[PDB]
Symmetry: C4
Subunit: 379 residues, 4 copies
C-alpha cells in the first residue's frame, strides 16, 4: 500500500528532502510519486542540521569575541544581545524543523492514505490542478528569499572586506543563511500542506452545496452521510497536520515576533546614528517585509481553512432550510449539524495559539511594545 | 431585473457617487431608484482619488521640506512623524474606500435582489420609513464634519498668512480635507447599510414574535420555516456586507486608533508649551470628539445587530417553551434553533476584529498606552 | 396590580429613596411593601443630585484656585489632575446613578410582576429568608463606608484647621462624601438585586434537581416544562437587570479602576516624601481596601449567577443520563438543553464587559501598569 | 464504606501527610490504603504551618532590620521589597495549601467513592499501573527541588559565614525552605490528582472507541448510556478537584508570575554589578528553570485533560457517522452529543483563569513587561 503523492507534495517534498526537512524516498512508480520513510536520509538530515548549528554557534562566538570595534555587524554592546538572539532563534527554528522531520513525515504518510481516499470521492484532477498552481508561488517566494539572503551575505562580506575580514565573516555567517533557507522551506512546506487540505475542504463544500440540493450521481440522502464521513476524515487530517507542525509553528511565530522586534530596532539605530549606508536601509526594509511575509505565510492558510469551515456551516444551514420537513433528508442534516457544532476545523499549534488573523494583531501589538521598550533602553 | 432602491440608499448613494465612493447610475424609474454599475463613473472616481492622493503627498513633502521654523503645523522634528502618519493614514483610508468601490457596489447590487425579496415578505413601508429617519442623522453628521474641516482649514490658513504662507498652506493641505470628507462619507455609508440590515432583522424578530405565537395571515408552522429561510438570506446579506467593507473597516479602525493617539498628544504639547492659541485647543478637543464619534459610527450598528440576534435567540426560546409538545410547531423551531446555534449575525472585518463594544475598550487602552509612550518620548 | 415587594428590596429601597436612587412610593399595604413610581420624588432626587454635583464642582474649582501651598489635599501640581479625576469620576458615577433612577425603577417594577410569579411556584418564604439575610451585610458595609467617610472628612478638616481653612475645606468637600454615599448605595442596590435573582435561580436549580429525578407534587414531565418556562422568565429578568444597571455598572468599573490607580499613587508619594502622617497611611490603606471591596461587590453576584447557570447545566446533564430512553421525559429535557445552549445567564453591562472574576484580573493588570506609569512620570 | 486508595494517592498522600497537606489516617487494610479524615493530624498540620509562617516572618523582619550592608541576600534598598515579596508569596502559598487541607481532603474523600465506581467499570489494574508510573516522576521532581533548596541554603550559609552571620542566616531562613517544600508538595499533589483523573478519562475514551463501534461484553446501545453516566461522574469529579484546589491554584499561578519576574531581575543585577559569584548565577538559572517547571506542573495536566475531552468529541463524531441511521444506537449518541456540547472538562481555578497552555503565554508576557519595568526602575 504505497503512499502515492504528486503535484505540490512532489516538488517541495524533494526540496525539503534536499535541505533535510523530508527524509523520504521518491520511487518514480506511476505518474505520481510513491514516498516512504528513508532511514539513512534521516541520518543525513540530522548530520546536516547538527553541522549547521555547530558552525553557526561557533561563528557567533567568534563574532562576539572579535570585538565591538572589529565586528561589522555587532558595532555595539547592546547590538550583541539582539544579534545573538536573532541568530539563536533561527538556529532553534531550523533544529526544530529538522529534529522532528522523521516524525512529521511519518504522520504525513499516515494521513496520506486517508486524504487519497477523500480525494477519490471528489476527483484527483482538481486537487492536482490546485496543487500545481501553488508551485509558482513556491518558486517565487523561494527565489525572493534566496536572492535576499545572497544580497545580505554579499553586502556584509564586502563591508568586512574593507577591514580585511571578508573570509572571517564568511566563515562566521556561512551556516546562518543555510539555517534561514531551512526555516523558509519548512514554512513553505507547512503552508502548502495546509493549502492542499483547504483545497480538499473546498471541494467538499462544493459537493455538499451541489449534491444535497438536487451532477449528482447519488441520492442526496446517502450523499449527506458520505460527506459527513468525509468531513470526519478531513478533521482527522487537519488534527494530524496541526499536531505534526505545532512545535515548528509556535517556534516560527516566536521567531517572527523577535525578528519584527529586532529589525526595526536596527533600522531606527541606523537612521539615528549613521544615515550613511543606503544598502543597509534597503536590506532592513526588505527584511521587515520578509518577516511580515513569513507571518502571512504561516497564518493565511489556517484562516482560509476556518473561512471554509464557516462556509460549510452556511451551506448546511441553507440545506436544512431547503430540506423537506420530517423526511429522510432531515435527520442526515441533523447529524452533520451536530458534527459541525462539536468540531471546528482550525489549527491550534501545541494548544497555545489559534493561528488566525486575530493572532496577527496581538503579535503586532507586542512587537510595537517591545520595540519602543528597546528604543527607550537604548537612550 | 433592475435593483430598485430608495430611502437611505438613495441620498447617501448619490453623495458617495459625487465623492467617488459609489459609481452607480441613478435612473429615476419608478418611485425608488434603479442603480447599476456605471463604468465611466468608476474611472472618474479612480482619477479623483489618485489626484487627491498625489496632491496630498506632494503637499506633505513640501511641508516637510519647508522647514520646522517656517511650517505652522509641523513646529517640531517629532511633530513631523506624527503629522505625516496622520496625513498618510487618511490618504490610505480614502484610497481603500475608493480603490474598491466598484467591487463593493457589485456586492451591494448582488445582495439588493435578496434583501428586496426579504423586505417584500415584511413590508417595504417600514423599511422606507426607517431608512428615511437615518437621513437626518446623515445630514447632521456630514454638516458637523464639514464645518469642522472648514474651520480647521481656515484657522491654519490665517495662521500661515501671518508669515506669508497662506496660499502655500492652502496648496499643501487642499486635498487632505477632501480625503477627510471621503473617509467620513465612507464611514457613514457603511453605518447606514448596517443600520438598514439591522432594521430588516428587527422586522424579522417582530414577525417571529407575533406570528409564531398566535396579524398572522399564515399558519405558524409554515411561518417558522419562512422565517428560517428569511434569516438565512439575512445572514448571507450580513456576510456580503462584512466582506465588502472589511478592509475599509479595519483601515478605519486603525486610523481611529492612530488619531486618538495623535490628537491628545498635540493637545498636551500645546497646553505644556504655549497655552496661547485657544482656537487650537478648541480644534483639538473637537477633533478628539470627532474621532470618538467616528469610532462609535463604526462600531454601534454592528453591536445593535448582535443585540438583535440575541433578541432572536430570546424570542425563539420563549416560542419553544410555549410550543405544543411533540407537535408540528416543535420540529420547525428545532431547525431554527440549530440555525441560531450554527450561525451568529456579526461583523468581522477581514476576520481580525469583531466590531463590537468590547473592541472599543481594547482600542482605548491601546490609545492610552501609546499616548503615554509618546509623552515619555517627548520628555 | 400592585408590585408587592419585601425583605431586601424593602430596606435598601427606602435607603436609596432617601439618597435619591429609588423614587418609589412605599404604601404599607399588606405585610410586604407596594412600590410604584413616585413622580415628585424623582424631581427631589434630580434636585438633590444636581445640587450635590454643582457644590462638588465649585468646591473642586475653589480648591484648585486656592493654591498648591495653601491646599492640604492638593500639595503638588501633579497631585491636582489625579485628585480632580478622583472627584469627577465619583461625581459622574453619582450622576449616572441618579440621572436614570426613574428608568431603572420602571424596569424593576416591570420585572417585579414576573419574578413574583416565579417565586409563587417556588415558595416566597425561602426568598424572604434569603433576602432578609442580606440586610446584615448591607448594614455592615454601609456602616463601614460611612465611618470611613466621616473619618476621612474629619482628618482633612483637622489638617486644614492648622492653617485656618477648616470651614473652607468643609465647604469644598461637603458634597464629595455625599456623592460617595450615593455611589456606595447604588453599588449595594445592584448587588442585592443580583443576589435576589441568584437566590431565585438557586431555588430553580434545587427544584429541577429534586423534581425531575423522582416532594414532587407534580409529574416530572410537566415539571420540566414548567421549569423551562421559569428559566425563560428568569433570563428575561436577568436581561432587564443588566440593561437597567449597565451604564452604572461600567461607570462603577472605570471608577474602581481609576481609584485603584490613584490611591496607591498617593500612598507611595507619602511613603517616599513624608512618612509623617500615620493617619494618612491608614486612610490610604483603608481606601484601597474599600475600592477592592467595591470591585468585589460589583463582580461577585454575577459570578455566582454564572456558577448557578453552570450548575443548571450539570443537573440537566445528570437528568438526561438518568432519564428513560425514548420516553416523554426525554424530549422535555431536549427542549431544556436547547434553551441552555442558546441562553446563558450572565451580566454584560452595555455589552462591553462581562462582569465576572476574569474581569478582575484584567482590571488589576491595568491598575498595575497605569500605577507604574504614574510612578515613572512623577520621577 | 471506607475510601480505598492506592498507587499515586498512597505515596504522595503520605508525603503530604508528613508535610501537613493531607491529614488522613492510613489504615493498612487490604492491598490498597483506607484513608479517612484524621482530626488531630489536622491540628498538627495547622500548628506546623503556623510555626513555619511565624518563624519565616520573624526571620524576614530580622533580615530587613539587620541592615543593607550586613545582609548578604538584601544588599540593596530596592532588593528588599522584591525579596520580601518573594518570601511572603511562598508564605501565603504554603498557608493556603495547609489552611484548607482538611476541606480538600474531605472533597477528595467525597469523590473517591465515585471515582472507584468509575474505575470498577473500566479496570483498576490500568489505573494502578498508570498511577504507579507517576511515582518515579514524583520522586525525581521532589529530589531535584530538595537538592536545589539544600544547595541554596548552604550557599547562603557559607556566604554569611564570611561575615560571621551563618547561624543568624540559618535562623532567619530556616522556615523559608520548609515553606518551599510544602508548596512544591502541594503542586505535585494537585498535578498527580489531575493526572489520575486524566488516566480515567483516557480509559473512558478507549472504551467509547472500542465498544460503541463493535472486547465488548455488552451491546453498544447500553454501552453508550453507561459511558454517558460515567462521563457525568467524571465531570463531577473534575469539578470537585477544581473547586478544592482553585485557591491554591491561583495562588501558585501568581507566585510563579512573581518569581519569574523576580529571579531574572536578580540574575541581571548580578551580571551587571558583580559578575563575581558563579554559584549565584548557577542558582539563579536553576531557580528560573524551577519556576518554569512549576508552571508546567500546574498547567500541563489540565491541558492534557482538555485534549482528552477533544478526543472524546472526535470519537463521538466518528461513532455518529458510523452509526446506523434511525436505529437505537443513534439517539444514545444524541444524548452523549448534547452532554459534550453542554459540558467541557476543564480546570478553572476560582473562575478567574482557565489553566491551559494559552495561560502560559499571557503569564510570560506579563513577566517580560514587569521585568523590564523593574529594570527601568533600577536604572
Ligand atoms: O538586520 C536584521 C535582519 O538581519 C538578519 O539577521 C539577517 O541577516 C535578520 O534575522 C534580521 O531581520
Ligand atoms: O491636530 C490633530 C488633528 O488635526 C488633523 O490632522 C486634521 O487637521 C486630524 O487628523 C487630527 O486629529
Ligand atoms: O487618597 C485617595 C483616596 O481619597 C479619596 O479621594 C476619598 O477622600 C478616594 O477617592 C481615594 O481612594
Ligand atoms: O534569587 C531568587 C530566587 O531565590 C529564592 O528566593 C529562593 O532562595 C526564590 O524564591 C527565587 O526564585
Amino acid at each position: 500500500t504505497p503512499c502515492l503523492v504528486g503535484g505540490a507534495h512532489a516538488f517541495i517534498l524533494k526540496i525539503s528532502s534536499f535541505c533535510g526537512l523530508a527524509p523520504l524516498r521518491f520511487e518514480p512508480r506511476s505518474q505520481e510519486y510513491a514516498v516512504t520513510i528513508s532511514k539513512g536520509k534521516c541520518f543525513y538530515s540530522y548530520i546536516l542540521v547538527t553541522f549547521l548549528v555547530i558552525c553557526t554557534i561557533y561563528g557567533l562566538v567568534a563574532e562576539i569575541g572579535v570585538g565591538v570595534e572589529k565586528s561589522v555587524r555587532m558595532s555595539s554592546r547592546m547590538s550583541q544581545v539582539v544579534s545573538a538572539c536573532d541568530i539563536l532563534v533561527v538556529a532553534v527554528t531550523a533544529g526544530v524543523g529538522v529534529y522532528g522531520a522523521p516524525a512529521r513525515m511519518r504522520t504525513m504518510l499516515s494521513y496520506m492514505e486517508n486524504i487519497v481516499a477523500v480525494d477519490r470521492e471528489l476527483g484527483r484532477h482538481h486537487s492536482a490542478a490546485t496543487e500545481r498552481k501553488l508551485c509558482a508561488l513556491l518558486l517565487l517566494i523561494l527565489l525572493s528569499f534566496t536572492i535576499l539572503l545572497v544580497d545580505d551575505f554579499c553586502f556584509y562580506a564586502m563591508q568586512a572586506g574593507k577591514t580585511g575580514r571578508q573570509w572571517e565573516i564568511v566563515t562566521n555567517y556561512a551556516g546562518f543563511y543555510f539555517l534561514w533557507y531551512i526555516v523558509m522551506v519548512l514554512e513553505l512546506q507547512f503552508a502548502f500542506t495546509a493549502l492542499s487540505l483547504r483545497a480538499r475542504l473546498k471541494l467538499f463544500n462544493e459537493a455538499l452545496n451541489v449534491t444535497a440540493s438536487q451532477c449528482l450521481q447519488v441520492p442526496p440522502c446517502e450523499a449527506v452521510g458520505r460527506l459527513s464521513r468525509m468531513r470526519c476524515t478531513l478533521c482527522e487530517v487537519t488534527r494530524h497536520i496541526a499536531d505534526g507542525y505545532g512545535l515548528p509553528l509556535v517556534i516560527i511565530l516566536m521567531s517572527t515576533l523577535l525578528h519584527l522586534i529586532v529589525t526595526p530596532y536596527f533600522l531606527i539605530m541606523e537612521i539615528i546614528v549613521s544615515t550613511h549606508r543606503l544598502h543597509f536601509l534597503v536590506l532592513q526594509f526588505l527584511w521587515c517585509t520578509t518577516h511580515l511575509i513569513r507571518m502571512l505565510v504561516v497564518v493565511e492558510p489556517c484562516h482560509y481553512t476556518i473561512r471554509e469551515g464557516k462556509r460549510t456551516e452556511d451551506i448546511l444551514c441553507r440545506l436544512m432550510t431547503l430540506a423537506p420537513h420530517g423526511g429522510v433528508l432531515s435527520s442526515r442534516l441533523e447529524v452533520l449539524s451536530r458534527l459541525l457544532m462539536l468540531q471546528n476545523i482550525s489549527y491550534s499549534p501545541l494548544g497555545m495559539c489559534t493561528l488566525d488573523r486575530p493572532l496577527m494583531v496581538t503579535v503586532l501589538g507586542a512587537v510595537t511594545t517591545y520595540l519602543v521598550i528597546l528604543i527607550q533602553f537604548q537612550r
